[model samples]
Target: PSMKLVKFRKGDSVGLRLAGGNDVGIFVAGVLEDSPAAKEGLEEGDQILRVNNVDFTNIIREEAVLFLLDLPKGEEVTILAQKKKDVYRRIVE
Candidate 1:
């Protein structure tokens, strides 16, 4: 499996921007420099599979955003994802 885990303590923010939704679950839109996501090596274009126990597949962007936004302060956010290039092979068959 090409899956990866990116866990970071919730500081001021996750410092990761997300895009896409049912179309492709979640695409890592951007990562702010010096942010938690950046320090954890999360990259833009990574396809997020889920967060904690939440399955992001087939979900709407708003719902995903809300979930991300509603995380309790100082929580250890656990994110599951696959790289952009790896996801291409996943969709092939």
Candidate 2:
């Protein structure tokens, strides 16, 4: 069987600001369902503002995603996500 390699995992922090200046949260929506995030509590439509306490900046989605994908694993990551002012976190292990 052939193995696979993907840049993103579950529980990883993701954020995106559309061209109109509306900050939109990003989630890993794809075939890999056993990632650290998917198994934890990260779901689609979760508004993500930061990772590891770093706020989200309005820029290219690919660049943001690439940045997170390059981080070291097994480290604690904090996500500044808001669901109607109910702030929470998703730590990457």
Candidate 3:
């Protein structure tokens, strides 16, 4: 089990620009430079599995965006993601 933790302010972006697929959940399509997600090493093709304990399998882009937007100020969001069947976790604050 691998995990990475990254902090972010309420007003700041997670920096993960993601897209969805019918077979996969939302996958990272891009990462913003110098942003929390970039620093955490989130990359294109990473499949998002969970957000703050909420399962993200088959999640739509709109739903995922709302999930991130609804996080409380300074709260840490636990994300579970996969790359080539390898599952991992990341904490976003």
Candidate 4:
């Protein structure tokens, strides 16, 4: 799978509306205009695959939200993500 990288420093917000849970999985519902998230190319329908190389695939929605919100302000964040339909696939018997 291929991943896209986005880097930004926190300000008022990451400027995103997030939704979904384990069943459907978390994804970007909307990206605010003129915000860092927009400037960095984060798009609506992009799903977060990882943060700093830590997989978020199996975590609960709130935990993921808290993790991002807890990052130190003014610190750069590297987000590794993929478009919603491109999440890694597994073959199950």
Candidate 5:
């Protein structure tokens, strides 16, 4: 029998949308030391407005968490986070 495991890279772009709502996109709300997101300079409260040029809306929190969990380990993902009037790209470690 083969075992399957989900792997996530250090810096991976994630799509997050409020549940039961139509606002969907990418954002940086979770950061951890030694994590790819942390190395990419992502911070909590960063607004992720889009993912792959697609606006995220109407997405549930559980769905978003699943999306992030689907990412491959060591993969590089780019996320666009907005802060004030400034928007920048953050690469997942």
Candidate 6:
């Protein structure tokens, strides 16, 4: 995975959306124009792996939302993401 770290400061709006969940895993789904996520090189389909000191390896959608809801205002934020790839295979056994 080509990992990339996205950094931005807390502002009026982060303007980022996420998709997928523990069932299928999480990945970047939407990024608004001129937004922090977009400006910081985040893109749709980038798999989220970690953020700040939190682990996203097995995170759920709601967990992420709640985490964002109480983020420290006026502070820097960091996100580690894996480039969009078709490598995560789920075995149906």
lDDT of each: 0.79, 0.43, 0.63, 0.71, 0.45, 0.74
lDDT of 1 by residue, 3-78 (tens): 7898998887777787777776677778899888778888877888888998877788788888888988788999
Per-residue alpha-carbon lDDT of model 5 for 1-93, expressed as tens digits? 121112234344433322222343334555666565555555654654443334444455566566656755456555555542132133221
lDDT of 2: 0.43
**Against the hidden reference, what TM-scores do the models get?**
0.84, 0.51, 0.70, 0.77, 0.52, 0.82
Ranking by lDDT: 1, 6, 4, 3, 5, 2
Candidate RMSDs in order:
3.8, 11.7, 6.5, 5.1, 11.5, 3.8
* Candidate scoring better on lDDT of 1 and 3: 1
In model 3, what lDDT does residue 42 have?
67
Q: Residue-wise lDDT of candidate 3 within 35-89, one digit each (tens)? A: 6666666676677777767777777678788777777756555677666323213
Better of 2 and 3 by TM-score: 3
C-alpha displacement of 91 in model 4, angstroms?
A: 20
lDDT of 6 by residue, 1-93 (tens): 458988898676566677766766667778788877788988877777887888887888888877765678777889888875453332111
Model 4 TM: 0.77
In candidate 6 the C-alpha lDDT for residue 8 amounts to 92
1-93 per-residue lDDT for model 2 (tens digits): 121121234244422322211243343333235555545455544455556645553535576566667555555555554332222134110
The 10-residue segment with the lowest total lDDT in model 4? 84-93
Between prediction 1 and prediction 6, the one with superior lDDT is 1
Candidate achieving higher TM-score, 1 or 4: 1
Candidate 1 yields a Cα-based lDDT of 0.79
Window of ten residues with lowest summed lDDT in model 6 = 84-93
Candidate 1, residue 34: CA error in Å?
Answer: 1.2
